[PDB]
Amino acid sequence: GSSGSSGGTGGEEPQRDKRLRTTITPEQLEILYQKYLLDSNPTRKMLDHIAHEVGLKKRVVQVWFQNTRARERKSGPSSG
């Protein structure tokens, strides 16, 4: 049970746009794949940020990771 943060700076309006879609894009995946390869065990915080920079439904970005892992771990390597 530990904590302790600091603050002191005016905030700014949130970010809203009609870009958030259910399905993923071939231009967004790249970012996800690159972020996954380097980080396959990210925390809610990361998932939130990444999904914010890539512009993809946080949920879709969060699950997309948990799903990929299961596959990677699932015995049975595929050599392309």
Give the C-alpha separation, 7 to 58, whole Å.
25
Give the C-alpha separation, 66 to 21, whole Å.
19
- Asked if 58 and 48 touch (Cβ cutoff 8 Å), the reply is yes
What length is written for the chain?
Answer: 80
> Tokens representing 14?
């949130």
AA letter at 29: L
Give the C-alpha separation, 29 to 24, whole Å.
7
Show the domain range for 44.
25-71
Helices (H) and strands (E) in the chain, counts: 3, 0
- Kindly report the CATH number assigned to the domain that includes residue 66: 1.10.10.60
Instruction: Give the residue among 78, 33, 75, 76 at the shortest CA–CA distance from 54.
Output: 33
Chain centroid to Cα 74, Å, comes to: 21
Burial of 56 (0-12, 13-18, 19+ CB in 10 A): buried
The method recorded for this entry reads: NMR
Instruction: Give the residue among 13, 8, 52, 28 at the shortest CA–CA distance from 44.
Output: 52
Give the C-alpha separation, 78 to 31, whole Å.
22
